[PDB]
Structure 1
Amino acid sequence: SPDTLVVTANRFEQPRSTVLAPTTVVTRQDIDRWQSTSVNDVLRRLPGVDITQNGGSGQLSSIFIRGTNASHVLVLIDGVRLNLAGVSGSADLSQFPIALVQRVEYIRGPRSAVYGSDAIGGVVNIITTRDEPGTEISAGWGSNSYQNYDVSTQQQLGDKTRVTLLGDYAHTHGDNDGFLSKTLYGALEHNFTDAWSGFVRGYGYDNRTNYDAYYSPGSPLLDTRKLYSQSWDAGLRYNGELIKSQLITSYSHSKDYNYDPHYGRYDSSATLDEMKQYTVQWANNVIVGHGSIGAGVDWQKQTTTPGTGYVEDGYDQRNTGIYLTGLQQVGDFTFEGAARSDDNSQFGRHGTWQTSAGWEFIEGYRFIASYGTSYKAPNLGQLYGFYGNPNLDPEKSKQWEGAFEGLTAGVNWRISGYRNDVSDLIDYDDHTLKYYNEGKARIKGVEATANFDTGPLTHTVSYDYVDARNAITDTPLLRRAKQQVKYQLDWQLYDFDWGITYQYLGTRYDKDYSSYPYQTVKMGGVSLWDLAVAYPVTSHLTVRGKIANLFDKDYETVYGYQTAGREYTLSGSYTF
C-alpha cells in the first residue's frame, strides 16, 4: 500500500508515507477479496485491533485499539463521529452495515488535536464514497442460513455530475433468529467548476436483531432489537492549487428499539433510544513551504429522547471545536502538528495537541518520535443517570511514541513502541452508587509490521504486543489479548485468486459468570485460519468462495458466548 493518499490525517489529501503516525488503509478490493461480511471482520485483522463480540453478527461488540478502552477509539463515517456511538459513548460496528464500507483509513495514535473527543487509541475512518464508476449486481449464500443480495452503481449524468446508488439486503442466523440488515444509499456529487464542487448524500438502514436476554418471571423478555438509522450529508468543496476548503454538514437520526415481540415494539415495557445528531464543519488547508497549515471549526449537536440511554429525561449536548494543524518538511526532517480546543455545553473547554518529528538518517530508513495529548468526554449515562454525575471531567491521555520505518530488499517494515498514560478515568462505585472520576492506566506496547512480495506470493504480516495495566493496582486491564499475530498470504494462480488469512490471538482474561463471587478466568490462546478463492468466469462474473475458520476452533472472546467454527460462503458478483 505505501505512498498512496489518505484524508484522515488532517482532513485533507496527503500521501500516506508523509503521515508520520502509524497507518493502515483497507480498500473495497481489499475487502472483496477477504469476503468480509461485517465491519468487525475488516477491522479484526488490522494491527493493534483487538475485538470482542457476544457471538455472531449484529451482536453487542467492542473494539480495543492498542489496549485502550472500548470508549477510546473514534470511529468516523466519511469524517464525522459515528452516530451510533452517541448514546453509549462507545463505538460499536456490529450494527453498521458492511455495504457502506469502501475505504478504511486507520491511523493509530492520539488525534484529539484534530478530531476532538475520544480519539485516544486511534481513528477508524470508514469511508462510504469511492471513485470506481460502473455497476455491480452481487449475491452471497452461506451457512447459518446466511443470504445476501446487493446492487450498486455510479454513473455520470453529464461530465460534471456523478450519481452513486446502492441497496443491500443481508440476513443471517447462528438467540434464535440472529441478525437482519437492510440498507439504502444514494449520493450525488457535482462540479460547479474545475475546483468548486458540492454534494448531497443520504443513506439509511434497518436492522432487526435477536439476542439472548436475562430472564425474570412476570416481566417481558426484551430479546429483540429493531434499529432504524439514517444520515444526510451535504457539502461544498473548493479544491484549489494552494488553498483547500471543506464546508460539511450532516444530520443523523437513529431509533433503537428493544422490546418483547409478544408485548410489542410500542408497548410501555419497550426501551427506545432515539438520538439526533447534527454537525457543521469548516476545514481549511493552505500549502506553505514544503508543507501546509490548516485550521477549521467543527461543531456538533446531540439530542436525546426521555428514556434514551437509561436516563429519565432527554438531554442536549452541544460542542464546538476550533483547531489548527501544521505540517512542514525541511531537508531530511519532518515536523507535523495539531492543536484543538473543545468548548462543551456540559464541561466547559479542554485543549489538546500532538507533535511529531521525522528525520530520515539513511535514504529509505527513518526514525519517528512523537508526543500527543488526547481526551474522552463523559457520556450521557454517567452524567445524567441515577449513577451519573454532572460535574465529571473528560478522561485524560498522555501518549508518547518512537518508531523506525524502512524499506529493505522489497520489504517495508516498522518496529515501534508506545507509551499511553490514561488518567482521570470515570468509574462506578458500589459503596456510594455514583460515577466518579478516579481511575488511571499505564499502557505499554510494541508494534511490528512488515509486508513483502516473494515471487507470486504477497505477504502482509504484523505483530502486536500490548500490556495494558491499571496504574494503581499494577493488575492487567482484563479482556485484552496479550499479543496477536496477523498474517495474510495472497497469491493468485492460474487466474484462481488465492488468499490465506491467519490470526493468532493471544490470551484474554475474562470473568466467569457461573459462580458467585464472579471469579476471573484465563482464556486460551488460539490460531485461526481462513481460506478464500475467487475465479473470474467472464470479464463480469467473478465467483468467489470462502471457508471461514477452517479447523473448526472453539474460541470465545466474551467468556460464555460461543462463536461459529466451520462455516462456508459461496458468492458471485457481476461487473459491467
Structure 2
Amino acid sequence: TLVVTANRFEQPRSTVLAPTTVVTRQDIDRWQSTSVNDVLRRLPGVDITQNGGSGQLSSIFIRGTNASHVLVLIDGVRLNLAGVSGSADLSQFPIALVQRVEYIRGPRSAVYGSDAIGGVVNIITTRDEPGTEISAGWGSNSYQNYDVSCQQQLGDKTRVTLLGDYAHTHGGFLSKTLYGALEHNFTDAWSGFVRGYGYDNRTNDTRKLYSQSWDAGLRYNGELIKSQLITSYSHSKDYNYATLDEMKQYTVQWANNVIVGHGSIGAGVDWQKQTTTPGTGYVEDGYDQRNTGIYLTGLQQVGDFTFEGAARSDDNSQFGRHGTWQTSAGWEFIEGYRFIASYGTSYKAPNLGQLYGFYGNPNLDPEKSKQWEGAFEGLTAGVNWRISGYRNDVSDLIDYDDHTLKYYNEGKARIKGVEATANFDTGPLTHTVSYDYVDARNAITDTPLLRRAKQQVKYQLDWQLYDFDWGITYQYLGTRYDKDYSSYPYQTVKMGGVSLWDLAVAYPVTSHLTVRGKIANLFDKDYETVYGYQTAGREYTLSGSYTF
C-alpha cells in the first residue's frame, strides 16, 4: 500500500494518480526469479528484449518508448550502469539485492529529471526483517546459487544488515555480490544510514564488470514535516576483451515535503556529477558532466476530486536549461470508481557518444516527450481493475545523419497505447492479469518502430492447497519487428507471437526451512526476443532457504 517513488516521500498508492505497481520480496521469492528482468517482465507495460539468457545485454521498452526512455533508480538514485550508454540495462544487476520494486508508469521528469519518459523503475535494496538466513539453489545449465544474509540490532536504535551472494549459470554468467548497511535513529524523528555494496560479474569474447555504490543520508520524519538529505557515490569498471568503460557518479539531493490540508507540498534540489575515464564509450577524452535541478510537487484532495502535480527545472552543463511539468486530476464520481486525466512533459539528455564520439554533435538538445493519459479505475464485485489510454508524442529524437556522419535532433515518434489490469480472487485462487496494446510509430514515416511487441497478455494465478504454495505464470508476447544482421542491407523481419508458461511451488518443510521448485518455460517453446539470439528452453530450478 505505501510508496515513495511518486514524490520521493511515503504516500499511499491510492493517492498516486499514475498507474503504479509494487513488487515485494515475498513476490520475488515465490516467483523464484533469478534475474531482475524476470521480475520486471511480469509487470504492466514492460517489454524486455535480451541477446540470449541471463547476463546478456538487454533493453527495457516501457510503453513503447525507446530503451533509453526509462528511468531506473536504485534506492532513489539513477542507476550507475546506465550512465556510459545513456540507456538502462539491468542484466548485470544482482537480483539478490532487490528487496522491493516500485514502478510508476507515465512521465516523471518533473520530479527526477532525465529519462523518466515511459515510466520510472525504482529498485529498493532495504529490508525491515530481522534475523539470519541461508539460501541456495541448483538448476538447469549448471545453475548454482549460495547466499548468506543477516540483519540485527546493535543495541538500541542502530541496526546492521549484511549480505553475500554467489550466482553462476553456464551457457556463461558469474556474479558475486556483497552488501552492508548501518541504520541509526538519533531520535524517533531523526534517522541516518550508511550503505555500501558492489558486485563482480563475468560474462562469456568476455566481459568483466565491477561496480560499487556507497550511499549516506539523514532523514527527518515528523508528524507534518519530512526531510531528506542524501549522498551517493558509484564507481563502475566495465571490461570487454581490450576496452575499458569507467564511470564515477556522485549525487547529492535535498528534499522536503510537508502535510498541508488533505495532501502535501514538497520541494527539492538535485545535483549530479558524472566523470568518465578517457576511452570510455568510444569517446577519446574523459568527460565531466554536471546537472542541477530544482523541483516542486503537490497533492491535494478536495471532495471527490484529487489533484497531483510536479514541476522541475534542470540546468545541464552541456545543453543548459530545460523545464518539465505534469498534472493529474481524478474524480471519484461514485464510491469505488474513478476517472483520471493526466498530462506531462519529459526529456532525455544526449549521451556521451552522441555528444563527443566519432560522429558527435556537441550542440544536441534533449529529446522531448508530451504525454496525455486518461483512465477509469474501479472496484466491482471484488474485482479491482483499471483501464488507461495514453498518447505519447516524442520529438527531437537524436538520429544519425548518414550523409554528414553526425548526430542531429530531428526524429519524431507517436505512441498510442492501452493498459488494462485486474486482480481478484475466486475462492482460494488469486488472479493478477494485465493486457497492453502499444502502437509505437515513427511519426514522420508512419512505420512501426522496431523491437516492440504490439500486444502482451500477462496472467498470474496463485493458490495454497496442503501446505504447497503454487504459482502459475502466463505471458503472451505479441508480434515483433526486428532487423536481421546476418545479411546486408539489413532487412526488417517479423517475429511471430508466443505463449510462455512457468510453474512454481514452495513448501515449508519445517517452520525454519522452505524448499522451492520451478519449471521456467514449461512447454520448451523456442523463441527469440532479439532476432538471432536463442533464449533458454525449459529450465528447472530447485532451491531452499533456512531461517533462524
Q: Structures share a fold, TM > 0.5?
A: yes
* CA distance in 1 between partners of 2:502 and 2:525 (Å): 11
Q: Alpha-carbon deviations, 1:352-401, whole Å to 9, x = none?
A: 00000011000000100010000000001100111111100000000000
Determine helix, strand or coil for the equivalent of 2:80.
Answer: coil
Q: Alpha-carbon deviations, 1:501-523, whole Å to 9, x = none?
A: 00001001011122221111110
Q: Alpha-carbon deviations, 1:399-428, whole Å to 9, x = none?
A: 000000010111100111000000000001
Kindly tell me the number of residue pairs found equivalent between the two proteins. 547
Residue 5, structure 1, aligned to residue 2, structure 2: yes
Q: Alpha-carbon deviations, 1:124-161, whole Å to 9, x = none?
A: 00000011111210001011011000011110111200
Determine helix, strand or coil for the equivalent of 1:58.
Answer: coil
Q: Alpha-carbon deviations, 1:485-516, whole Å to 9, x = none?
A: 00000011101010000000100101112222
Q: Alpha-carbon deviations, 1:177-236, whole Å to 9, x = none?
A: x110000000010000010010100001000111xxxxxxxxxxxx11101100000000
* CA distance in 2 between partners of 1:322 and 1:59 (Å): 37
* CA distance in 2 between partners of 1:566 and 1:228 (Å): 30
* CA distance in 2 between partners of 1:21 and 1:72 (Å): 17
Q: Give the alignment partner of residue 43 of structure 2, picking from 46, 65, 82.
A: 46
Residue 284, structure 1, aligned to residue 256, structure 2: yes
* CA distance in 1 between partners of 2:131 and 2:480 (Å): 44
Determine helix, strand or coil for the equivalent of 1:280.
Answer: strand
State the Cα RMSD in Å.
Answer: 0.6
Determine helix, strand or coil for the equivalent of 1:114.
Answer: helix
User: In the alignment, what sits opposite 1:130?
Assistant: 127
Following superposition, the deviation at residue 23 of structure 1 comes to 0.4
Q: Give the alignment partner of residue 247 of structure 1, picking from 222, 225, 229.
A: 229
Determine helix, strand or coil for the equivalent of 2:439.
Answer: strand
* CA distance in 1 between partners of 2:419 and 2:398 (Å): 28
User: In the alignment, what sits opposite 1:528?
Assistant: 500
Q: Give the alignment partner of residue 90 of structure 2, picking from 93, 114, 124.
A: 93
Determine helix, strand or coil for the equivalent of 2:83.
Answer: helix
* CA distance in 1 between partners of 2:353 and 2:547 (Å): 47
* CA distance in 2 between partners of 1:205 and 1:252 (Å): 12
Identity of aligned residues (%): 100
* CA distance in 1 between partners of 2:483 and 2:407 (Å): 22
Q: Alpha-carbon deviations, 1:26-63, whole Å to 9, x = none?
A: 00000000000000000001010000000011100000
* CA distance in 1 between partners of 2:361 and 2:28 (Å): 43
* CA distance in 1 between partners of 2:251 and 2:123 (Å): 17
Q: Alpha-carbon deviations, 1:86-118, whole Å to 9, x = none?
A: 000000000111011000000000000000001
Q: Give the alignment partner of residue 411 of structure 1, picking from 360, 380, 383.
A: 383
Structure 2 counterparts to residues 35-74 of structure 1, below 5 A: 35-74=32-71
User: In the alignment, what sits opposite 2:198?
Assistant: 204
Determine helix, strand or coil for the equivalent of 2:284.
Answer: coil
* CA distance in 2 between partners of 1:572 and 1:554 (Å): 29
User: In the alignment, what sits opposite 2:185?
Assistant: 191
Q: Give the alignment partner of residue 350 of structure 1, picking from 282, 306, 322.
A: 322
* CA distance in 2 between partners of 1:58 and 1:65 (Å): 20
Question: What TM-score do the two structures reach when normalised by structure 1?
Answer: 0.95
* CA distance in 1 between partners of 2:82 and 2:486 (Å): 30
* CA distance in 1 between partners of 2:301 and 2:129 (Å): 32
* CA distance in 2 between partners of 1:275 and 1:168 (Å): 24
* CA distance in 2 between partners of 1:133 and 1:435 (Å): 52
* CA distance in 2 between partners of 1:79 and 1:510 (Å): 33
Q: Alpha-carbon deviations, 1:304-340, whole Å to 9, x = none?
A: 0000010001000000010100111011111101010
Determine helix, strand or coil for the equivalent of 1:473.
Answer: coil
* CA distance in 2 between partners of 1:557 and 1:507 (Å): 10
Following superposition, the deviation at residue 431 of structure 1 comes to 1.5
* CA distance in 2 between partners of 1:69 and 1:469 (Å): 11
* CA distance in 2 between partners of 1:495 and 1:502 (Å): 23
Structure 2 counterparts to residues 260-279 of structure 1, below 5 A: 270-279=242-251
Q: Alpha-carbon deviations, 1:451-502, whole Å to 9, x = none?
A: 0000010000000000000000000001100100000000111010100000
Determine helix, strand or coil for the equivalent of 2:234.
Answer: strand
* CA distance in 1 between partners of 2:457 and 2:367 (Å): 30
Determine helix, strand or coil for the equivalent of 1:113.
Answer: helix
Residue 225, structure 1, aligned to residue 217, structure 2: no
Determine helix, strand or coil for the equivalent of 2:48.
Answer: strand
* CA distance in 2 between partners of 1:227 and 1:515 (Å): 31
Structure 2 counterparts to residues 109-188 of structure 1, below 5 A: 109-174=106-171, 178-188=172-182
Question: What TM-score do the two structures reach when normalised by structure 2?
Answer: 0.99
* CA distance in 1 between partners of 2:281 and 2:64 (Å): 26
* CA distance in 2 between partners of 1:438 and 1:33 (Å): 46
Following superposition, the deviation at residue 575 of structure 1 comes to 1.4
* CA distance in 2 between partners of 1:135 and 1:47 (Å): 34
Determine helix, strand or coil for the equivalent of 1:10.
Answer: coil
* CA distance in 1 between partners of 2:487 and 2:372 (Å): 41
* CA distance in 2 between partners of 1:568 and 1:101 (Å): 22
Q: Give the alignment partner of residue 15 of structure 2, picking from 3, 13, 18.
A: 18
Following superposition, the deviation at residue 17 of structure 1 comes to 0.9
* CA distance in 1 between partners of 2:306 and 2:14 (Å): 12
* CA distance in 2 between partners of 1:492 and 1:317 (Å): 52
Determine helix, strand or coil for the equivalent of 1:84.
Answer: helix
* CA distance in 2 between partners of 1:415 and 1:147 (Å): 41
Determine helix, strand or coil for the equivalent of 2:424.
Answer: strand
* CA distance in 2 between partners of 1:17 and 1:131 (Å): 23
* CA distance in 2 between partners of 1:236 and 1:566 (Å): 47
* CA distance in 2 between partners of 1:281 and 1:140 (Å): 39
* CA distance in 2 between partners of 1:485 and 1:315 (Å): 43
